[PDB]
């Protein structure tokens, strides 16, 4: 790009490609996201233009928004690594619990902030959580289903991940609440702890049944109204709920208790980011620094 000397391609999100680039003028290194078409709507440019004011230590700062030629460019502060790479890098030893706790705590602060401002992320996943050498972790991407709406893929033939999708979404609820972000964060928390995706579905139905096999097929008792959901079918198999101690060993009881609250089927029962920050699990929370290999 004329103003940016693209360093490299560091990703290809569900909306566009992300590049590491240097402002030929300021010399600042940033993350430049190219957005995907036939004119680029204005309702979105506003939704986006609104994000620039959403500043918090646990939210990646959106520096500039540039609309030009069917392509929208989002300029973000650059962070050196994402949680997916860090988890892969920590696979053999596991991320130390104090760091897992710090990361969870910070992301909940980020979400509490977003949610208090009625902003929903909607697509939390390891690849959308960025970390630095200082021990911070920030929410990135935020998708844009409200400012657009996930079509059929990312933008150019790429398998979207369903692993962190809340059940109400999979069951066709058209109106997501902040609860979907807590569910996703719950899934990531479990994954950091066990070093294995909690619900690695490879299709919407497989994702749904993996959740059902583990947490039990929901019914009107645990989730009032579930049998009325758009994609609910009486023919869904009926699996019993598995014991939580088998789901995330060796997470301690405080952690398991918090996780169960983040994974309640009923969105209305699911814990809020604000309430989660008060959970006993965070009593001894600290801010360790990660060992990042850049
Ligand atoms: N600001 C920002 N910084 C990133 N850094 C890296 C990310 C990954 C790696 C890596 O895998 O080595 C290095 C730096 S990615 C990113 C984004 O704002 C973003 C993330 C995901 C989707 N869309 C935009």
UniProtKB/Swiss-Prot annotation:
Family, as annotated: Belongs to the protein kinase superfamily. CMGC Ser/Thr protein kinase family. CDC2/CDKX subfamily.
Identification of the protein by name: Cyclin-dependent kinase 2
GO molecular function annotation: ATP binding; cyclin binding; cyclin-dependent protein kinase activity; cyclin-dependent protein serine/threonine kinase activity; magnesium ion binding; protein domain specific binding; protein serine kinase activity; protein serine/threonine kinase activity
UniProt cofactor(s): Mg(2+)
Entry EC no(s): 2.7.11.22
Species name: Homo sapiens
Upper classification of the organism: Eukaryota, Metazoa, Chordata, Craniata, Vertebrata
Chain positions found as N6-acetyllysine: 6
Gene: CDK2
Cellular localization per UniProt: Cytoplasm, Cytoskeleton, Microtubule organizing center, Centrosome; Nucleus, Cajal body; Cytoplasm; Endosome
């Amino acid at each position: 790009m004329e103003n940016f000397q693209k360093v490299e391609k560091i990703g290809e999100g569900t909306y566009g490609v992300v590049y590491k680039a240097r402002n030929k003028l300021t010399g600042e290194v940033v993350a430049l996201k190219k957005i995907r078409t036939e004119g680029v709507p204005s309702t979105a440019i506003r939704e986006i233009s609104l994000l620039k004011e959403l500043n918090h230590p646990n939210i990646v700062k959106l520096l500039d928004v540039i609309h030009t030629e069917n392509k929208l460019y989002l300029v973000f502060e650059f962070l050196h690594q994402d949680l997916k790479k860090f988890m892969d890098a920590s696979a053999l030893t596991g991320i130390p619990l104090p760091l897992i706790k710090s990361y969870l705590f910070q992301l909940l602060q980020g979400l509490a902030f977003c949610h208090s401002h009625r902003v929903l992320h909607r697509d939390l996943k390891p690849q959308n959580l960025l970390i630095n050498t200082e021990g911070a972790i920030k929410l990135a991407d935020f998708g844009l289903a409200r400012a657009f709406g996930v079509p059929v893929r990312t933008y150019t033939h790429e398998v979207v991940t369903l692993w962190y999708r809340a059940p109400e979404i999979l069951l066709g609820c058209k109106y997501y609440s902040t609860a979907v972000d807590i569910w996703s964060l719950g899934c990531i928390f479990a994954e950091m702890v066990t070093r294995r995706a909690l619900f690695p579905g490879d299709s919407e139905i497989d994702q749904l049944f993996r959740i059902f096999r583990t947490l039990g097929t929901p019914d009107e008792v645990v989730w009032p109204g579930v049998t009325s959901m758009p994609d609910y079918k009486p023919s869904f198999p009926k699996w019993a709920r598995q014991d939580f101690s088998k789901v995330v060993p060796p997470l301690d009881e405080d952690g398991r208790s918090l996780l169960s609250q983040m994974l309640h089927y009923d969105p209305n029962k699911r814990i809020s980011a604000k309430a989660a920050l008060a959970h006993p699990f965070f009593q001894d929370v600290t801010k360790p620094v990660p060992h990042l290999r850049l």
